[PDB]
């Protein structure tokens, strides 16, 4: 709702490329004190999970926004969004953005339906 911050998050895809190892080490040091072991029989309420489960989870308020560039949005039975990202990698670690500034399922659906799942629909000039 207006003025409020999101409380429930839906997993979309796994990403592990695009950052230099120095950036990865910096992010790991930043987030180390917030990671919690993930229990399949007792998952967190703020993070629902599909078929794919993480080894450790972090509460959204302590996490970091990452800018992701991926070939297209394709259907998936491993993530609750009903879809995942093809060829995903991290372009920037959005330290200028807050955790609550993450996009919504409405934005994800808009992007999926803009060009039949293809995320490239703008001409080059």
């Amino acid at each position: 709702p207006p003025g409020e911050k999101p409380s429930v998050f839906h997993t979309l895809s796994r990403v592990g490329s695009g950052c230099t190892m120095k950036e990865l080490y910096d992010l790991g040091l930043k987030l180390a004190k917030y990671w919690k072991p993930f229990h399949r029989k007792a998952p967190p309420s703020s993070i629902l999970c599909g078929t794919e489960k993480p080894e450790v989870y972090i509460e959204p308020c302590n996490s970091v926004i990452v800018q992701i560039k991926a070939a297209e949005i394709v259907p998936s039975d491993m993530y609750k969004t009903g879809c995942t990202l093809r060829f995903p990698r991290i372009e920037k670690i959005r330290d200028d953005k807050e955790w609550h500034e993450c996009m919504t399922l409405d934005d994800l659906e808009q992007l999926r339906g803009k060009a039949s799942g293809k995320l490239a629909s703008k001409h080059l000039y």
């Binding site: 120095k22 080490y25 910096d26 040091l29 930043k30």
Partner: protein, 121 residues
């Protein structure tokens, strides 16, 4: 050794209140001694082996910045080819007025841990 490789010397001084104002007598001062040593060696390295790398990084300070945002560590000038723009930065601290500047800009000297100092250098 591999010729294109280059020598690299990093400088690391105890920034605690221990030696900041030890000055048992009035003829020397360990910080005024360590900084003098750093300035001398670094100016010599300017002319000698200008291709090499030097860096100065203080530990135990109260202000903080480093690569990993740790506690009580200050990387004054990073590793890079030597230059005057850093001769001046070091010279800014040479003096009783200079030590006043150093203390009121980074700190009297807080708690520390040389483990984390070795980790960061």
């Amino acid at each position: 050794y591999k010729y294109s490789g280059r020598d690299s010397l990093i400088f690391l001084v105890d920034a605690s209140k221990a030696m900041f104002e030890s000055q048992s007598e009035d003829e020397l001062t360990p910080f005024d001694m360590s900084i003098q040593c750093i300035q001398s060696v670094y100016i010599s390295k300017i002319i000698s082996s200008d291709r090499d790398l030097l860096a100065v990084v203080f530990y135990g300070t109260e202000k903080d910045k480093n690569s990993v945002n740790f506690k009580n560590i200050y990387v004054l000038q990073e590793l890079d080819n030597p230059g005057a723009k850093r001769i001046l930065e070091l010279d800014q601290f040479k003096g009783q007025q200079g030590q006043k500047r150093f203390q009121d800009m980074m700190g009297h000297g807080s708690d520390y841990s040389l483990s984390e100092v070795l980790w960061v250098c």
